[PDB]
Design an enzyme around this catalytic site. Structure first.
Site, short mmCIF file in Angstrom:
data_model
loop_
_atom_site.label_atom_id
_atom_site.label_comp_id
_atom_site.label_asym_id
_atom_site.label_seq_id
_atom_site.Cartn_x
_atom_site.Cartn_y
_atom_site.Cartn_z
N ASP A 35 25.50 115.67 -35.66
CA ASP A 35 25.53 116.52 -36.68
C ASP A 35 26.75 116.65 -37.58
OD1 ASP A 35 24.90 119.03 -38.08
OD2 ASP A 35 24.93 120.39 -36.35
N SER A 199 27.24 117.08 -56.52
CA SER A 199 26.20 116.22 -56.99
C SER A 199 26.02 116.28 -58.34
CB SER A 199 24.69 116.46 -56.55
OG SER A 199 23.83 115.78 -57.19
N1 LIG Z 1 21.68 122.20 -37.82
C1 LIG Z 1 22.24 121.96 -36.21
C2 LIG Z 1 20.80 122.17 -35.27
C3 LIG Z 1 20.34 121.12 -34.82
C4 LIG Z 1 18.87 121.11 -34.13
C5 LIG Z 1 18.50 122.36 -33.94
C6 LIG Z 1 17.10 122.52 -33.17
F1 LIG Z 1 16.30 122.62 -34.03
F2 LIG Z 1 16.96 121.34 -32.23
F3 LIG Z 1 17.02 123.66 -32.56
C7 LIG Z 1 19.03 123.67 -34.30
C8 LIG Z 1 20.40 123.53 -35.03
#
Ligand SMILES: NCc1ccc(C(F)(F)F)cc1
EC number: 3.4.23.22
Length: 330
Positions: A35, A199
């Site tokens: 992430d 952008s």
């Molecule tokens: N942006 C970070 C994130 C990634 C995945 C999830 C989930 F959907 F897996 F819960 C929530 C938040």
């Protein structure tokens, strides 16, 4: 040194991407969601509340000969979607596709919100935003990338996300065979802890390019492309039957439509997102109303170049002293 690991969509919609990560000694492989929108490496573990674990692979620090409890450290994080998690911290050896970091902070979850429990395919997150966003208290911890940086051949990582297909996260090197043309590099502001950039504009399908500055973050951990309401309304006005629905929570369109592409500007260069990337399928099983992959950022407070936009490009997260972002077509 370098690292190279394959990233795979968790489902048929590319809702998220998972990448295998080795933690501890002997190695425990967990599939983490890389992430670039957060900076915490957290995992489901032997300490996660039993009723909150449903099919995820857990990290058991007691089975790792290199695991050390980071005394007194706790973490607590909330994501943009309303999801959250918290727990304690261990330090352990962590490797991604051959690249090893010893003493990496591995945040062990004691509690996870329902969205995480429901995602049986995601064993945790590996944050790649700037370490300034890290939530470890009282001693803030560094990301995997920040810890590996000095040892990398080049202080970069690249995201090459596939469209309904596997892709690659590379660390320390740029694969010149993974993209076409040239990579266009653009300035990054680290003031908010994100890979935040500007952008230069957009186009809808075969329309004329609109030169307009759109400040936003390159976020592999966000599924969709969130842009200003003006931009999003201009896109959805080109699809017959498309509308914003408050009951669904965004723009929906007839599943029978063939969507136009969406082009975004990177300096004088253009990244074209094919129309099929913007189809997130039926809003509910069997529905003929499909959810759009381009949504308004109006309620968020920041524009998000999520997976919808990133997967149309080979993306360089350059972590040099002056960090930049590179985008190339592929
Ligand atoms: N942006 C970070 C994130 C990634 C995945 C999830 C989930 F959907 F897996 F819960 C929530 C938040």
């Amino acid at each position: 040194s370098t690292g190279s690991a394959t990233t795979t969509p968790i489902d048929s919609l590319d809702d998220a991407y998972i990448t295998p990560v080795q933690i501890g000694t002997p190695a425990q492989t967990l599939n983490l969601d890389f992430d670039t929108g957060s900076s915490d490496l957290w995992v489901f573990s032997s300490e996660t509340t039993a009723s909150e674990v449903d099919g995820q692979t857990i990290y058991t620090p007691s089975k790792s000969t290199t695991a050390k409890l980071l005394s007194g450290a706790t973490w607590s994080i909330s994501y943009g979607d309303g999801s959250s998690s918290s727990g304690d911290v261990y330090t352990d050896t962590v490797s991604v596709g051959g690249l090893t970091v010893t003493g990496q902070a591995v945040e062990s979850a004691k509690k996870v919100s329902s969205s995480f429990t429901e995602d049986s395919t995601i064993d945790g997150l590996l944050g790649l935003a700037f370490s300034t966003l890290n939530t470890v208290s009282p001693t803030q911890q560094k990301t995997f990338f920040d810890n590996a940086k000095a040892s990398l051949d080049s202080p970069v990582f690249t995201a090459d996300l596939g469209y309904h297909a596997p892709g690659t996260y590379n660390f320390g090197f740029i694969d010149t065979t993974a993209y076409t043309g040239s990579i266009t590099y653009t300035a990054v502001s680290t003031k908010q802890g994100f890979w935040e950039w500007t952008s230069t504009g957009y186009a809808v399908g075969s329309g004329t390019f609109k030169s307009t500055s759109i400040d936003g973050i390159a976020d592999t951990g966000t599924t969709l492309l969130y842009l200003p309401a003006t931009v999003v309304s201009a896109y959805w006005a080109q699809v017959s039957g498309a509308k914003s629905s408050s009951s669904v929570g965004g723009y929906v369109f007839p599943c029978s439509a063939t969507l136009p592409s969406f082009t975004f500007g990177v300096g004088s260069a253009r990244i074209v997102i094919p129309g099929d990337y913007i189809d997130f399928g039926p809003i509910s099983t069997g529905s003929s109303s499909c959810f759009g992959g381009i949504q308004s950022s109006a309620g968020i407070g920041i524009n998000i170049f999520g997976d919808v936009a990133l997967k149309a490009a080979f993306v360089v997260f350059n972590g040099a002293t002056t960090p930049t972002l590179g985008f190339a077509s592929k």
